[PDB]
Amino acid sequence: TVTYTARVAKARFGGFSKLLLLWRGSIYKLLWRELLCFLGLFMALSAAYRFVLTEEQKRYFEKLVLYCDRYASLIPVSFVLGFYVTLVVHRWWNQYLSMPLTDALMCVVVGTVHGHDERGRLYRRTLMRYAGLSGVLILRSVSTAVFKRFPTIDHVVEAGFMTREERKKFENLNSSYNKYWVPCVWFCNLAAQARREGRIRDNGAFKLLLEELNVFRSKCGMLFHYDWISVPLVYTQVVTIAVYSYFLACLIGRQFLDPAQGYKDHDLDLCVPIFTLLQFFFYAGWLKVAEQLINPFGEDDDDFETNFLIDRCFQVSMLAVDEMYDDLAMLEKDLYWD
Amino acid sequence: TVTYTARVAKARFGGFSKLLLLWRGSIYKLLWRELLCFLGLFMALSAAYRFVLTEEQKRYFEKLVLYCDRYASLIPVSFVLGFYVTLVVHRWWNQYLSMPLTDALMCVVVGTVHGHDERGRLYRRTLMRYAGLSGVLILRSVSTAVFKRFPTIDHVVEAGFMTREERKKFENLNSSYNKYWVPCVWFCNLAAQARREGRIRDNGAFKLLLEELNVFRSKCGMLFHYDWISVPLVYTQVVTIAVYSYFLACLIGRQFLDPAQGYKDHDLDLCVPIFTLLQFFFYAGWLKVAEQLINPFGEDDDDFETNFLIDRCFQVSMLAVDEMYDDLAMLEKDLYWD
Amino acid sequence: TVTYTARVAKARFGGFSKLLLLWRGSIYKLLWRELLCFLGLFMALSAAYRFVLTEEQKRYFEKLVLYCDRYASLIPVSFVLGFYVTLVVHRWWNQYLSMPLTDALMCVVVGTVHGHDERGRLYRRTLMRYAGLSGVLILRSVSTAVFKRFPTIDHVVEAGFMTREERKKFENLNSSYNKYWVPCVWFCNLAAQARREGRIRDNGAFKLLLEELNVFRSKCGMLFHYDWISVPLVYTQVVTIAVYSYFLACLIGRQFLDPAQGYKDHDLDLCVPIFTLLQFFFYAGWLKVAEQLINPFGEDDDDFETNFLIDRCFQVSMLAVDEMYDDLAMLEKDLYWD
Amino acid sequence: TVTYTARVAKARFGGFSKLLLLWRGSIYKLLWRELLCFLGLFMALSAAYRFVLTEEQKRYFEKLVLYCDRYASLIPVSFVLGFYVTLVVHRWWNQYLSMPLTDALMCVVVGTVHGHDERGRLYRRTLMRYAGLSGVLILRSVSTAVFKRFPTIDHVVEAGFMTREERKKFENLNSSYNKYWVPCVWFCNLAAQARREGRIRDNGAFKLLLEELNVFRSKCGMLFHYDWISVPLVYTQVVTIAVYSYFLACLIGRQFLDPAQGYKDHDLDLCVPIFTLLQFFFYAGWLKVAEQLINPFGEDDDDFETNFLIDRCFQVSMLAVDEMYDDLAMLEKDLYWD
Amino acid sequence: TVTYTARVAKARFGGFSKLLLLWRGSIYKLLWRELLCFLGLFMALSAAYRFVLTEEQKRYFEKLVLYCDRYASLIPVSFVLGFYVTLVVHRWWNQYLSMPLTDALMCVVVGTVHGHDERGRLYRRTLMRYAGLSGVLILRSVSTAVFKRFPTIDHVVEAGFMTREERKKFENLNSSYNKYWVPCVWFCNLAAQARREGRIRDNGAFKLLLEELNVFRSKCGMLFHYDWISVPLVYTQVVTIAVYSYFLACLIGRQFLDPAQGYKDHDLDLCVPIFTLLQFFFYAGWLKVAEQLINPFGEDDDDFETNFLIDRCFQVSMLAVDEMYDDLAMLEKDLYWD
Ligand SMILES: [Ca+2]
Ligand SMILES: [Ca+2]
Ligand SMILES: [Ca+2]
Ligand SMILES: [Ca+2]
Ligand SMILES: [Ca+2]
Ligand SMILES: [Cl-]
Numbered sequence A, B, C, D, E: 001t002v003t004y005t006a007r008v009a010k011a012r013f014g015g016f017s018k019l020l021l022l023w024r025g026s027i028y029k030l031l032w033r034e035l036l037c038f039l040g041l042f043m044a045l046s047a048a049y050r051f052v053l054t055e056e057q058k059r060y061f062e063k064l065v066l067y068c069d070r071y072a073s074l075i076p077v078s079f080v081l082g083f084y085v086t087l088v089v090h091r092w093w094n095q096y097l098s099m100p101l102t103d104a105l106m107c108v109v110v111g112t113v114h115g116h117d118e119r120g121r122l123y124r125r126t127l128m129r130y131a132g133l134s135g136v137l138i139l140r141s142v143s144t145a146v147f148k149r150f151p152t153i154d155h156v157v158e159a160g161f162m163t164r165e166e167r168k169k170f171e172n173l174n175s176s177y178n179k180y181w182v183p184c185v186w187f188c189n190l191a192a193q194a195r196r197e198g199r200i201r202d203n204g205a206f207k208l209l210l211e212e213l214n215v216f217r218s219k220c221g222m223l224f225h226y227d228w229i230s231v232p233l234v235y236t237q238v239v240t241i242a243v244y245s246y247f248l249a250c251l252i253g254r255q256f257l258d259p260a261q262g263y264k265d266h267d268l269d270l271c272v273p274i275f276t277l278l279q280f281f282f283y284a285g286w287l288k289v290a291e292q293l294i295n296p297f298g299e300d301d302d303d304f305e306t307n308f309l310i311d312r313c314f315q316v317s318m319l320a321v322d323e324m325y326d327d328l329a330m331l332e333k334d335l336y337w338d
Helices: A027-052 A055-074 A077-097 A103-112 A118-142 A144-149 A153-158 A164-172 A182-196 A203-228 A233-253 A274-294 A306-323 B027-052 B055-074 B077-097 B103-112 B118-142 B144-149 B153-158 B164-172 B182-196 B203-228 B233-253 B274-294 B306-323 C027-052 C055-074 C077-097 C103-112 C118-142 C144-149 C153-158 C164-172 C182-196 C203-228 C233-253 C274-294 C306-323 D027-052 D055-074 D077-097 D103-112 D118-142 D144-149 D153-158 D164-172 D182-196 D203-228 D233-253 D274-294 D306-323 E027-052 E055-074 E077-097 E103-112 E118-142 E144-149 E153-158 E164-172 E182-196 E203-228 E233-253 E274-294 E306-323
Strands: none
Touching: A027 A233, A027 A274, A027 E233, A055 A233, A055 B274, A077 A203, A077 A233, A077 A274, A077 B077, A077 B274, A077 E077, A103 A118, A103 A203, A103 A306, A103 E182, A103 E203, A118 A144, A118 A153, A118 A182, A118 A203, A118 A306, A144 A306, A153 A164, A182 A203, A182 B103, A203 B103, A203 B203, A203 E203, A233 A274, A233 B027, A233 B274, A274 E055, A274 E077, A274 E233, B027 B233, B027 B274, B055 B233, B055 C274, B077 B203, B077 B233, B077 B274, B077 C077, B077 C274, B103 B118, B103 B203, B103 B306, B118 B144, B118 B153, B118 B182, B118 B203, B118 B306, B144 B306, B153 B164, B182 B203, B182 C103, B203 C103, B203 C203, B233 B274, B233 C027, B233 C274, C027 C233, C027 C274, C055 C233, C055 D274, C077 C203, C077 C233, C077 C274, C077 D077, C077 D274, C103 C118, C103 C203, C103 C306, C118 C144, C118 C153, C118 C182, C118 C203, C118 C306, C144 C306, C153 C164, C182 C203, C182 D103, C203 D103, C203 D203, C233 C274, C233 D027, C233 D274, D027 D233, D027 D274, D055 D233, D055 E274, D077 D203, D077 D233, D077 D274, D077 E077, D077 E274, D103 D118, D103 D203, D103 D306, D118 D144, D118 D153, D118 D182, D118 D203, D118 D306, D144 D306, D153 D164, D182 D203, D182 E103, D203 E103, D203 E203, D233 D274, D233 E027, D233 E274, E027 E233, E027 E274, E055 E233, E077 E203, E077 E233, E077 E274, E103 E118, E103 E203, E103 E306, E118 E144, E118 E153, E118 E182, E118 E203, E118 E306, E144 E306, E153 E164, E182 E203, E233 E274
């Protein structure tokens, strides 16, 4: 994620012009290789037309250029591309919203799972750790960065999200499906035990705990589903062919023709098709942004900060349910009591 | 479902070009027959114009070609097609979201329905099995693949989702409507019995069980409704006529005319209307993708994996509520306890 | 409702071509009268130009035709029509979702309202019947078909949804507003009585019953609101004028002009403006589909099956809460118990 | 609100043509003054060109007309207008959905607040009246019609929504912010008292009451927020300038030029720019509909019926919680009992 | 926020014309500097062409102008800009909806946390103050205006939202992440203590308190996430380049050419490209509105009134839970009791 929210708090004369200077997370870094390839192909074709082709070959080439310029608009680039990008962006925000955050659970846990003693601390920390473990399991399933951090379950154990006995039980479960849901079931069982022992003092609190657990587990399931049900491959293929087919056609149709031939709208050889380069910038960059966003859990500059979220959630959950449990300042009259 | 999420985790120079090489779930496999039919019809008309028609017939045909090319744009293909595809895709994701998954129920069941003995195991497994049975019934109602797997209720019994006595009661119910809802009522009754016998220890847990049951049953009902209330037939007919009428017109309007006749924008006979073939690819392929997505529970390559989901849900539910019930590792201090 | 979901489970070579053969619920049945009127008006004007008009009148008419063809595009048909159809379709699906279905209530009722005796059966059946009665009242308020089935409250009594004493109380209530909400209040009172007598064993179950009642009542209220707050009349008038004004203009602008006059793009008299007929088909058919969908509770072929839903809900609710109350097969080990 | 839902239950040959005859709530009534002003300005300019201008002035004017007709399309009317109208309509439906209806509260109140005696009736009626009072306060804050009905709090007292002692307490509260939320806090306090005295028999019912109160209060808050956070002024200004600037340009660019001058596409003087009048009708009428909808709580014909809703809610709430409290017909076997 | 909802309650002849006179929050104030820069650059280029360039240089410049006018349309300004503005506006309303308002919490607190004595008042005021403190912390994190009001936590203490002992505990917590969530955990702990001491009389009320706390905390978290996950930088850069590149091209392509040269559509030198100025107004103003809205928590005229909301919430919460706790007018018969 490349945040710039603070820099655009106010409308100002410069606008986003200062943002145009950023490299990390920028369109330029995404697209300069493709832009250079388009420009190089165009210049090679132009040089061939200017220096290699005989006069008769030049006349036929001019006919081909006029034809391609005339009929490249038959390719409905904006239609398919607008649809595709809208779908990708909608999925992008929904996937961020499905991130397995444990803040609501930590609030319920600190409010409902009681005891200053070692056993109460163990209950609170372990419930929070099961939630964090489910998050880690699903994220190493769907995020390339998290998987690199945790290539094996042994790495999960070494980071402290899972104990060795927990690891043994996890591997002993006979199931060929992804086991990210296992710590949520452990959470439900541990909550039942806490209720049975009276650490959870009432049925309503136990119910709230199970409700928030199911909300969390559903976020993990949504991440699983977004990972499994990709944007339909047909759409990705079609949009890709649309952009590439159009610019392949433009490599010919946008050639600068010999002004002495007197073709309509061809009396100026600027030698750099700067409007065509701008059009490639916009359409191919739109597609390139969709490419970055389609899997927001990779290692693009602006992909989601999944490892950061894992670390933050573990740290904040442990703080909230262990250090801050039943640790309040004195009930005092506020400044505006009178 | 043809997943490729992992392959597009990062924006890369190639883009989706590597995805262009996929066959299963690809646009090519969906559309090559129609594309070949368009090309063959076009070439037959071109050959007739080139070899069969007399000169006067050729002049009249050229007039017709110019006319059709001029006025085919009157057909608003992008308008109707954009609307139709947007509707279909929205329905597609909502239908996936309505898949009858039992994970939330299994969490509540393992947390609230107690007893290590045979009776407690029976309660937990049977509640989960009733949920899975409702899923199977609705899916064999709406999914062609699931119906092929379970052509009769006898097949449901043989797979273990329903007992023979349960089958007898199911058939004895006098109702002409789809009975997918029956196991959800069985679930409610069994939960009431569990509460009465004390297996469900509190009213809040019983309430949570009924809430999650109703959420699940509503997902099944949504699948029923999406199956019953198709995309309006008027829309499907109109969009189909739009695409076919436009390309039927293009079969004439996009013919290559004799360059010696000197018609404007007709001084080049490439003999293959490659831009028209690309346009058919895009518009007819858009329609073909809508055709794949409109019923996502069929046997297209990228239709939903309904049998896989049935098997996964049964396996995971049974594991969670039977093997993992009240089976926790020792409460131990974590790595960062200190 | 004209369902065809099963026929389009798989993408196939034919596509929706087989659907083009359907009459009931088809675009043809909606639009053939208007299409024939457009064609007849066009042919009358063409015949007048061809046979009645003098040469000078013909020249002036040709000028008028060129002018109308030139400037009919000033009318923004696709703009207003796209907006209008999007609004109508969104409302269409939301109205279907607001249908007063009693399945969730029947689940809660069978799970929480107890007694095999006559009194318990009366409680369960009467709660379900009050819900069904509220549905019937709102549907006869908003659906023309349901109102034809139940023109008076006496017809409601004769169908069994309301008793004679209930009818007397219903008429004795002094209120000029629609009384569809009355049986929901009766439901709340009857539930309170069931709780007081112990038929509802716990406060949580009573709360769940009231929650589901309020969900149901809100669906009925949403139907009332969609019926009362029509699509703004301004929009319907404007879109109607847009389509009609454009095709009125096309009746002149799309006339086939005498080819001997040599007007640009007018050297071919096909005598049937088939592209204009196709354009009327698409735009006027889009408007005609909006006309069908704007009130989905009428008697169009593809309007919602409101009487079917009323009958199904009553039958299924009675079955679920009376015949299937506390009527379970023996708790038995499943096939995969071991 | 101008309802016509019943008249369009079925698709019919006439379509919406019969709706074109309506005046109240019609586009004509909204737009005839502006349309007449456009037509008058156009005719004045035409008369000046036809009768006042010298020949040389006429030639320069013809140049200006051609220029304006050529370049008025630079103004992106459909772009900004489509966006603006979409935003306004979305807000319109959301604002209707936020109307402070008390039906859900009345159901909960009649089901949970008990006693046939005077005190129980007082509790039920006063809880409902507090909800209705909050509705009245917010509506007189946001609806011009309601404010005209209740220009002062004294008018609220005289209508019976607030007692004199309640008025004294309401004015004694020291707060410069809108006090619409005050009766909701009174509601919470009165519910707490009812629970303490046993009129609310259980904690679950008290919780449900507070939940529904918070839902209602949130609807009132949403109305407050929609009133405070207008559609951004920048958008309204920009869209207004777009429509006006375009038609100001059309006043010149759409002038009928002297046919003897032989300008291309100017050989016909119809003297009434009927296509331009139609275009003003559509674009300016779209803007005019947005003007009606942007504040749906005013006194436009099709604005929401806020006074009607206030009266209906008070009448229905009082009926439901006072006359119909614990007033049920005998539990009797229904027609299909056997 | 610049509200004008009251001024547009009714559709009127003037329309939004009176709104065109507003300066604060207007498009003019946002855009006059950029508009003046465009106009100045255009006039400098025009003066150079008119007075500095030699005849041959003038002919080449005319060729360049024709070329740029021809090909600037290749830049898809409306495509990218429409997408970008739609995304920004959606985020804008969602961010307003995530504002940390404490009204629902104050209702629950006044209804569930009891005692007229000093301790009960302390409980109610402190729970509300913790909620308000979390709001202040997140808002000083995301709003430039709030941060200016509270540059340090010491300023938070001095305003009364946090006590000195609370400040000491807040700083003693060892965490590098934003601590806005800390007072919500304090809230949960204080609620647990209130329940333990009997100030919260029942488990259901305690559950409702925790539910509303989690709703509030989630609003704060949503503000954090919208601040962190900006609109993707790629989109902002691309849209900015689109608008600037197009108008840079227009600086040349829209030059008034010498009418004696006889170029098509160039026989009129108005010397002020008023249609191009209008087009810059619309497109660049659309972008400028997106610039204002992208961070709605800054100090633009129409940014959200965050300091106002902080003050209002504190005042109203304190009033509701302290002055109005259990302070009701006598239960009296209403006007329509009979
Ligand atoms: Ca990525
Ligand atoms: Ca399919
Ligand atoms: Ca209908
Ligand atoms: Ca209004
Ligand atoms: Ca801002
Ligand atoms: Cl609850």
